[PDB]
Amino acid sequence: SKAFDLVVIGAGSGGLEAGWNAATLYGKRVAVVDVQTSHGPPFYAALGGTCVNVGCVPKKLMVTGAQYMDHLRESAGFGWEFDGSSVKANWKKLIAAKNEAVLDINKSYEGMFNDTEGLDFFLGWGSLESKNVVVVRETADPKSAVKERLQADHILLATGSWPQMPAIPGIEHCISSNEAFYLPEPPRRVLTVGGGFISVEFAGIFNAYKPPGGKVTLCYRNNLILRGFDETIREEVTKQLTANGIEIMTNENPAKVSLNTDGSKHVTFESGKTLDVDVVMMAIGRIPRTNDLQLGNVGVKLTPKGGVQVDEFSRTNVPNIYAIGDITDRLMLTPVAINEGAALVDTVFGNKPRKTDHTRVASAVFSIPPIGTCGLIEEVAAKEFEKVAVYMSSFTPLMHNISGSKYKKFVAKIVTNHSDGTVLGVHLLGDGAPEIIQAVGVCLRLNAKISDFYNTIGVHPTSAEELCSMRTPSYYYVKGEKMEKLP
């Protein structure tokens, strides 16, 4: 049995920020628990967290690899010549390069623990035995062998989330993004189920690495993918994914999946339609990872949706027990979880309470082409403000008239409170949009107005300078209703 100021369950994005800051900035004694020291089967997430192991980091590398399908074709317009029929996409090489990069990060986190005073790592499954006791066991079974009993002044829950799987016959023949990262071969035919960023991103990945004759289908149960993003951009990215060979099935939802004699999957949709694919990847959502923590032992309250309930300072209903990151079922982003962890430790172990601002968080979708966005979409703005202006620019950049990818329209939209010009939201689609949007996030913390953008001198030639060239609204929302001109 061992004594700590802070025990962190989950060595992930938010958990490592909290642990490292508590130890090195405040001299505290810190224990951090995770179920695996490096990435992959059987538990997928590991030391480093979901983003590091089966998340942002590997998916970004694989999206980068998938973009070369466009680069190779588009180079022809600029005079590059080579034997197109000799081109092949080696998925095994991608996966191996990805595995080595992830493993390197796993190893560096190991050395971080070895090098840091007051920061100890424990392997296994952590759960709440008592208000000030964290137990570590061999497996997720609450009856497997105890390895450690850690007593804690403070406990931080940071176990992240997990893929949601629908309760349909044959769900066991489907995979999630976890398994997608380790497929031995690129699927020739794949259905990705869901309208959100994980489904969209992997559709683009599989589309580039599919073998000859392959086909990627994405299905989504409602009318338009990427709910919560700008509507113009949701429609455009639909169009540009279709232009690159991806079939988008909207208003369709799998009802059952069955095994074919050749190992492929027979999908039946609620509509009666059927589709045979090699892989069915469910990406319909991610849910807080709360079940193995034994929160009933101490009475941590959950919300109706299953997150650990927290106040703005990440405090549960139980004194000295905190929750940050995806387990709180708010914004499931790595930088938000990091911010939450650091604010928590500043509050608890320093003389300054800090709370994370969950508004105006910049984020991205690494679709091909990608999205960058910060702040409110226009229909959410229209419910909060009497007068909303939308400034819009949408064109194919000159380079893609030459590249041949004429479908690749760049979209830039600025949403303002039209009563005082305050920028409420900025939404981008096109090459570079994730990079363009970062300092827009800083602008929104200086209460930038549309005139601050338009009076800034552009950098030319760029996509980004579009943001500084919009003077006149394209249309408005007044009292929640969309109209081209003001009343």
Ligand X SMILES: Cc1cc2nc3c(=O)[nH]c(=O)nc-3n(C[C@H](O)[C@H](O)[C@H](O)COP(=O)(O)OP(=O)(O)OC[C@H]3O[C@@H](n4cnc5c(N)ncnc54)[C@H](O)[C@@H]3O)c2cc1C
Ligand Y SMILES: c1cc(-c2ccc3c(c2)OCO3)n[nH]1
Binding residues for Mg(2+) are 113, 116, 119-120
Minimal distance, residue 143 CB to a second copy, in Å: 38
DSSP 8-state code for residue 427? E
Q: Which residues of 174-184 are buried (b: 16+ CB within 10 A; e: fewer)?
A: bbbbbebbbbe
In the list 108, 222, 271, 462, the residue contacting a second copy (rule: CB under 8 A) is: 462
Cβ(226)–Cβ(241) below 8 Å: no
User: Does 335 sit near ligand X (CB under 6 A)?
Assistant: yes
**Coil/strand/helix, residue 147:** strand
Query: How many of the chain's residues bind Br ion (CB under 5 A)?
Result: 13
Cβ(280)–Cβ(175) below 8 Å: yes
Which range of residues in 87-95, 128-136, 292-300, 398-406 is near Br ion by CB under 5 A? 87-95
In the list 88, 143, 305, 352, the residue contacting ligand Y (rule: CB under 6 A) is: 88
Binding mask 188-227 for ligand X (x = CB under 6 A): ----------x-----------------------------
Tell me whether residue 215 or residue 289 sits nearer to ligand X (CB atom): 289
User: Does 171 sit near ligand Y (CB under 6 A)?
Assistant: no
User: Does 14 sit near ligand X (CB under 6 A)?
Assistant: yes
| Nearest residue to ligand Y, by Cβ distance, number only | 84
Structure tokens at 341: 């962890």
- Give, as ranges, the residues between 364 and 423 that touch a second copy (CB under 8 A): 364, 372, 398-399, 401-402
DSSP 8-state code for residue 303? P
Q: How far apart are CA 417 and CA 398, in angstroms?
A: 32
The residue with tokens 């320093």 is: 350
Laid out side by side, the sheet with 481-483 consists of 362-365, 371-375, 422-429, 410-417, 387-395, 475-478, 481-483
User: Does 313 sit near a second copy (CB under 8 A)?
Assistant: no
User: Does 482 sit near a second copy (CB under 8 A)?
Assistant: no
User: Does 214 sit near a second copy (CB under 8 A)?
Assistant: no
In the list 42, 79, 84, 111, the residue contacting ligand Y (rule: CB under 6 A) is: 84
Structure tokens at 153: 């002044």
CA angle centred on 196, ends 364 and 46, rounded to 5°: 75
Query: For residue 369, is the peptide bond before it cis, meaning its omega torsion is within 30 degrees of 0?
Result: yes
The 10 Å Cβ neighbour count of residue 83 is 6
Breaks (C-N over 2.5 A) in the chain follow: none
Q: How far apart are CA 426 and CA 464, in angstroms?
A: 12
Structure tokens at 352: 């300054």
The residue with tokens 């680069």 is: 71
Which residues contribute to the annotated binding site for NAD(+)?
194-201, 285
Cβ(374)–Cβ(425) below 8 Å: yes
User: Does 75 sit near a second copy (CB under 8 A)?
Assistant: yes
Minimal distance, residue 160 CB to ligand Y, in Å: 34
Which residues contribute to the annotated binding site?
13-14, 34, 46, 50-51, 59-60, 113, 116, 119-120, 126, 159-161, 194-201, 220-222, 227, 285, 326, 332, 334, 364, 460
User: Does 321 sit near ligand X (CB under 6 A)?
Assistant: no
User: Does 13 sit near ligand X (CB under 6 A)?
Assistant: yes
Quickly list H helices, 271-372: 334-349
Total residues belonging to the chain: 487
Q: Which does 467 bind (CB under 5 to 8 A by kind): ligand X, a second copy, Br ion, none?
A: a second copy
First-last CA distance in the chain: 71
Binding mask 52-91 for ligand X (x = CB under 6 A): ---xx--x--------------------------------
Query: How many of the chain's residues bind ligand X (CB under 6 A)?
Result: 38
Tell me whether residue 84 or residue 272 sits nearer to ligand Y (CB atom): 84
Residues known to be catalytic: 460
Which residues would be at the binding site for ligand Y (CB under 6 A)?
Answer: 69, 72-73, 84, 87-89
Which residues would be at the binding site for Br ion (CB under 5 A)?
Answer: 90-92, 194, 220-224, 284, 451, 454, 471
Which residues would be at the binding site for ligand X (CB under 6 A)?
Answer: 9-15, 33-35, 43, 45-46, 49-51, 55-56, 59, 125-126, 158-160, 177, 198, 289, 292-293, 325-327, 332-335, 337, 460
